Amino acid sequence: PVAVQCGRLFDARSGQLKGPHTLLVADGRIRQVLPGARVVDLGDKVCLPGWTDLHVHLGEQSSPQSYSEDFRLDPVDHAFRAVGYAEKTLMAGFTSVRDLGGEVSPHLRDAINQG
Amino acid sequence: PVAVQCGRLFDARSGQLKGPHTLLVADGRIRQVLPGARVVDLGDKVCLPGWTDLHVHLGEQSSPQSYSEDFRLDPVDHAFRAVGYAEKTLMAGFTSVRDLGGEVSPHLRDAINQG
């Protein structure tokens, strides 16, 4: 049960920035948004929900050697690179993505969901 | 029957440069080498036998896009390029070549021999 302390809350539904707020997190879900249990301090930070990227290709990245690469590399190499690509995407603030092509993402999703 | 007039003859067998000479050409072969019939003047030129290149690949040429090209191009394109490559080779003084790899040269040789 971790209580997160935020100096400023962004209301996605309306589109306005509210004042200080306290979020109660339990069981992986948000329980209470009481304005104002381990404590997390973010007093000097603007609090926002996680971002979603509705168009990504986590199995690949463009390079000067991209086109010649489609006959030399196996999907295992693409998975080994997608590990780092997914970590980079998560650290940038995007907690969800929609992948729009490639047969490694269904396996990457299964691996991520299993921890 | 064309008589070629040469100011200086190179003797390949011995390796020395001789003096003026007259070659008699008939039936695609050399008949007489009399020292001295249509006449060809090369008085200011050193005459030498045709050259041979014992290692060529007339079906290809190296380029920055060479490796990515092995999955996109068909042998017909390679033949169309080998036409110009063979003309360039012949004009440089090489009347014979030994080709050491590629399945277009046996067809190029047949085409050249047929005229």
CSV table of C-alpha atoms in Angstrom, one decimal:
chain,number,residue,atom,x,y,z
A,1,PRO,CA,0.0,0.0,0.0
A,2,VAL,CA,2.0,3.0,-1.3
A,3,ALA,CA,0.6,6.6,-1.0
A,4,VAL,CA,2.0,8.9,-3.7
A,5,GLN,CA,2.2,12.7,-2.9
A,6,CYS,CA,1.8,15.0,-5.9
A,7,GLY,CA,2.1,18.8,-5.9
A,8,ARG,CA,0.0,19.2,-9.0
A,9,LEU,CA,-2.5,16.8,-10.6
A,10,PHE,CA,-3.3,16.8,-14.3
A,11,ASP,CA,-7.0,15.9,-15.0
A,12,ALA,CA,-7.0,14.0,-18.3
A,13,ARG,CA,-10.8,13.8,-18.5
A,14,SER,CA,-11.2,17.6,-18.4
A,15,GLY,CA,-7.8,18.9,-19.4
A,16,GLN,CA,-6.9,21.2,-16.4
A,17,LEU,CA,-4.2,21.2,-13.8
A,18,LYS,CA,-5.5,20.8,-10.3
A,19,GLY,CA,-3.7,21.4,-7.0
A,20,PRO,CA,-1.9,19.0,-4.6
A,21,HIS,CA,-3.2,15.5,-4.3
A,22,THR,CA,-2.6,12.2,-2.7
A,23,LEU,CA,-3.1,8.9,-4.5
A,24,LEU,CA,-3.6,5.6,-2.7
A,25,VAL,CA,-2.3,2.6,-4.6
A,26,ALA,CA,-3.2,-1.0,-3.6
A,27,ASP,CA,-3.3,-4.3,-5.5
A,28,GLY,CA,-2.0,-2.5,-8.7
A,29,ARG,CA,-5.0,-0.2,-8.8
A,30,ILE,CA,-5.9,3.3,-7.7
A,31,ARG,CA,-8.3,3.3,-4.7
A,32,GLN,CA,-8.5,6.9,-3.4
A,33,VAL,CA,-7.7,10.4,-4.8
A,34,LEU,CA,-8.1,12.2,-1.5
A,35,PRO,CA,-6.8,15.8,-1.8
A,36,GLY,CA,-4.0,17.1,0.4
A,37,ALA,CA,1.3,3.0,4.1
A,38,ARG,CA,4.8,3.8,2.6
A,39,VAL,CA,5.0,7.4,1.4
A,40,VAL,CA,6.4,8.6,-2.0
A,41,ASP,CA,7.3,12.4,-2.2
A,42,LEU,CA,6.9,14.2,-5.5
A,43,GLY,CA,6.2,17.7,-4.2
A,44,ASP,CA,8.2,19.5,-6.8
A,45,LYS,CA,6.9,17.4,-9.7
A,46,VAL,CA,3.8,17.7,-12.0
A,47,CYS,CA,1.8,14.4,-11.6
A,48,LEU,CA,0.4,12.8,-14.8
A,49,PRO,CA,-1.1,9.5,-16.0
A,50,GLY,CA,1.1,7.2,-18.0
A,51,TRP,CA,1.4,7.8,-21.7
A,52,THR,CA,0.3,5.6,-24.6
A,53,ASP,CA,2.0,5.3,-28.0
A,54,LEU,CA,-0.6,4.1,-30.6
A,55,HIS,CA,1.9,3.4,-33.4
A,56,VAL,CA,5.3,1.6,-32.7
A,57,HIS,CA,7.4,-1.1,-34.2
A,58,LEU,CA,9.3,-2.6,-31.3
A,59,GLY,CA,10.8,-5.3,-33.4
A,60,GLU,CA,13.0,-3.1,-35.6
A,61,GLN,CA,14.8,0.2,-35.9
A,62,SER,CA,15.8,2.1,-39.0
A,63,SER,CA,19.5,2.2,-39.9
A,64,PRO,CA,21.7,2.7,-43.0
A,65,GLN,CA,21.9,-1.1,-43.2
A,66,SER,CA,18.2,-1.7,-42.8
A,67,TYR,CA,17.3,-3.1,-46.3
A,68,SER,CA,20.3,-5.4,-46.6
A,69,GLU,CA,19.5,-6.8,-43.2
A,70,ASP,CA,16.2,-8.7,-44.1
A,71,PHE,CA,18.1,-11.7,-45.5
A,72,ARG,CA,20.9,-12.1,-42.9
A,73,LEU,CA,19.3,-11.7,-39.5
A,74,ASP,CA,17.0,-14.1,-37.6
A,75,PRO,CA,14.0,-13.1,-35.4
A,76,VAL,CA,16.1,-14.1,-32.3
A,77,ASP,CA,18.4,-11.1,-33.0
A,78,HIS,CA,15.3,-8.9,-33.3
A,79,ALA,CA,14.0,-10.1,-30.0
A,80,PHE,CA,17.4,-9.4,-28.3
A,81,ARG,CA,17.3,-5.9,-29.6
A,82,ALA,CA,13.6,-5.5,-28.8
A,83,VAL,CA,14.5,-6.1,-25.1
A,84,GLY,CA,16.5,-2.8,-25.0
A,85,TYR,CA,14.0,-1.0,-27.2
A,86,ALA,CA,11.1,-1.9,-24.8
A,87,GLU,CA,13.1,-0.8,-21.8
A,88,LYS,CA,13.9,2.5,-23.5
A,89,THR,CA,10.3,3.0,-24.4
A,90,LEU,CA,9.1,2.3,-20.8
A,91,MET,CA,11.6,4.7,-19.3
A,92,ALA,CA,10.5,7.5,-21.5
A,93,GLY,CA,7.1,7.6,-19.8
A,94,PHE,CA,5.1,5.3,-22.1
A,95,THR,CA,3.4,2.6,-20.0
A,96,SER,CA,1.4,1.2,-22.9
A,97,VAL,CA,2.0,0.8,-26.7
A,98,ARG,CA,0.1,-0.4,-29.7
A,99,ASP,CA,2.4,-2.5,-32.0
A,100,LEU,CA,1.3,-2.3,-35.6
A,101,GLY,CA,3.4,-5.1,-37.3
A,102,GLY,CA,6.0,-7.7,-36.7
A,103,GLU,CA,5.9,-11.3,-35.4
A,104,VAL,CA,8.1,-10.7,-32.2
A,105,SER,CA,5.7,-8.4,-30.3
A,106,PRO,CA,3.2,-11.2,-29.4
A,107,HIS,CA,6.2,-13.0,-27.8
A,108,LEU,CA,7.6,-9.8,-26.2
A,109,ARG,CA,4.1,-9.1,-24.7
A,110,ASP,CA,4.0,-12.6,-23.3
A,111,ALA,CA,7.4,-12.2,-21.8
A,112,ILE,CA,6.7,-8.8,-20.3
A,113,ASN,CA,3.4,-10.0,-18.8
A,114,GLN,CA,5.2,-12.9,-17.2
A,115,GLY,CA,7.8,-10.6,-15.6
B,1,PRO,CA,43.7,-9.4,-97.2
B,2,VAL,CA,45.0,-6.4,-95.1
B,3,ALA,CA,48.7,-5.6,-94.8
B,4,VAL,CA,49.5,-3.8,-91.4
B,5,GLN,CA,52.6,-1.6,-91.4
B,6,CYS,CA,54.4,-1.3,-88.0
B,7,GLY,CA,57.3,1.0,-87.1
B,8,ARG,CA,58.4,-1.2,-84.2
B,9,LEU,CA,57.6,-4.9,-83.5
B,10,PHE,CA,57.7,-6.4,-80.1
B,11,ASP,CA,58.9,-10.0,-80.0
B,12,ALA,CA,56.9,-11.8,-77.2
B,13,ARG,CA,58.9,-15.0,-77.5
B,14,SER,CA,62.3,-13.4,-76.9
B,15,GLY,CA,61.4,-10.1,-75.2
B,16,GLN,CA,63.0,-7.5,-77.4
B,17,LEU,CA,61.8,-4.7,-79.6
B,18,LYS,CA,62.6,-5.2,-83.3
B,19,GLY,CA,62.5,-2.7,-86.2
B,20,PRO,CA,59.9,-1.9,-88.8
B,21,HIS,CA,57.8,-4.8,-90.0
B,22,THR,CA,54.8,-5.7,-92.3
B,23,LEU,CA,52.2,-8.2,-91.3
B,24,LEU,CA,50.0,-10.0,-93.8
B,25,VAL,CA,46.6,-10.9,-92.5
B,26,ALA,CA,44.3,-13.3,-94.4
B,27,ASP,CA,41.5,-15.6,-93.2
B,28,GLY,CA,41.8,-14.3,-89.6
B,29,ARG,CA,45.3,-15.6,-89.3
B,30,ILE,CA,48.8,-14.2,-89.7
B,31,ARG,CA,50.5,-15.4,-92.9
B,32,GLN,CA,53.8,-13.4,-93.4
B,33,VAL,CA,56.0,-11.2,-91.2
B,34,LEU,CA,58.1,-9.9,-94.0
B,35,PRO,CA,60.3,-7.0,-92.8
B,36,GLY,CA,60.1,-3.6,-94.3
B,37,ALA,CA,45.9,-5.8,-100.4
B,38,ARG,CA,44.5,-2.9,-98.3
B,39,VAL,CA,47.2,-1.0,-96.4
B,40,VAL,CA,47.0,0.0,-92.6
B,41,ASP,CA,49.5,2.6,-91.5
B,42,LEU,CA,50.9,2.5,-87.9
B,43,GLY,CA,54.3,4.1,-88.5
B,44,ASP,CA,54.3,6.1,-85.3
B,45,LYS,CA,53.0,3.3,-83.1
B,46,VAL,CA,54.8,0.4,-81.3
B,47,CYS,CA,53.0,-2.8,-82.5
B,48,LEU,CA,52.4,-5.6,-79.9
B,49,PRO,CA,50.2,-8.8,-79.8
B,50,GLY,CA,46.9,-8.7,-78.1
B,51,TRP,CA,46.8,-9.0,-74.3
B,52,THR,CA,45.2,-11.7,-72.1
B,53,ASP,CA,43.7,-11.2,-68.7
B,54,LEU,CA,43.8,-14.5,-66.8
B,55,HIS,CA,41.5,-13.4,-64.0
B,56,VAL,CA,38.3,-11.4,-64.5
B,57,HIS,CA,34.6,-11.5,-63.5
B,58,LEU,CA,32.7,-10.0,-66.4
B,59,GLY,CA,29.3,-10.7,-64.8
B,60,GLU,CA,29.8,-8.2,-61.9
B,61,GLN,CA,31.4,-5.1,-60.7
B,62,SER,CA,32.0,-4.0,-57.1
B,63,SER,CA,29.9,-1.1,-55.8
B,64,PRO,CA,28.7,0.3,-52.4
B,65,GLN,CA,25.4,-1.5,-53.0
B,66,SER,CA,27.1,-4.9,-54.0
B,67,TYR,CA,26.0,-7.1,-51.1
B,68,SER,CA,22.4,-5.9,-50.9
B,69,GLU,CA,22.1,-6.6,-54.7
B,70,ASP,CA,22.3,-10.4,-54.5
B,71,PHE,CA,18.6,-10.8,-53.6
B,72,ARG,CA,17.0,-8.1,-55.9
B,73,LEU,CA,18.7,-8.5,-59.3
B,74,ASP,CA,18.2,-11.2,-61.9
B,75,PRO,CA,20.9,-12.7,-64.2
B,76,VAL,CA,19.3,-10.8,-67.2
B,77,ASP,CA,20.4,-7.5,-65.6
B,78,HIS,CA,23.9,-8.9,-65.1
B,79,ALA,CA,24.0,-9.8,-68.8
B,80,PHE,CA,22.9,-6.4,-69.9
B,81,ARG,CA,25.7,-4.9,-67.8
B,82,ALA,CA,28.2,-7.5,-69.0
B,83,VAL,CA,27.7,-6.3,-72.6
B,84,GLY,CA,29.2,-2.9,-71.7
B,85,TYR,CA,31.8,-4.5,-69.5
B,86,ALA,CA,33.0,-6.8,-72.3
B,87,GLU,CA,33.2,-3.9,-74.8
B,88,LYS,CA,35.2,-1.8,-72.3
B,89,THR,CA,37.6,-4.8,-71.8
B,90,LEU,CA,38.1,-5.3,-75.5
B,91,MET,CA,38.8,-1.6,-76.2
B,92,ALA,CA,41.5,-1.6,-73.5
B,93,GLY,CA,43.6,-3.9,-75.6
B,94,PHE,CA,42.6,-7.3,-74.1
B,95,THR,CA,41.6,-9.6,-76.9
B,96,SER,CA,41.2,-12.7,-74.6
B,97,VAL,CA,40.1,-13.2,-71.0
B,98,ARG,CA,39.8,-16.1,-68.6
B,99,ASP,CA,36.6,-15.8,-66.5
B,100,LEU,CA,36.8,-17.4,-63.1
B,101,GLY,CA,33.3,-17.5,-61.8
B,102,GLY,CA,29.7,-16.7,-62.7
B,103,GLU,CA,27.0,-18.3,-64.8
B,104,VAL,CA,26.6,-15.6,-67.4
B,105,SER,CA,30.0,-15.8,-69.1
B,106,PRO,CA,29.3,-19.2,-70.9
B,107,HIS,CA,26.3,-17.3,-72.5
B,108,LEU,CA,28.3,-14.2,-73.1
B,109,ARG,CA,31.0,-16.3,-74.8
B,110,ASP,CA,28.4,-18.0,-77.0
B,111,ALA,CA,27.0,-14.6,-77.9
B,112,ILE,CA,30.4,-13.1,-78.8
B,113,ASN,CA,31.4,-16.1,-80.8
B,114,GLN,CA,28.2,-15.8,-82.9
B,115,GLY,CA,28.8,-12.1,-83.6
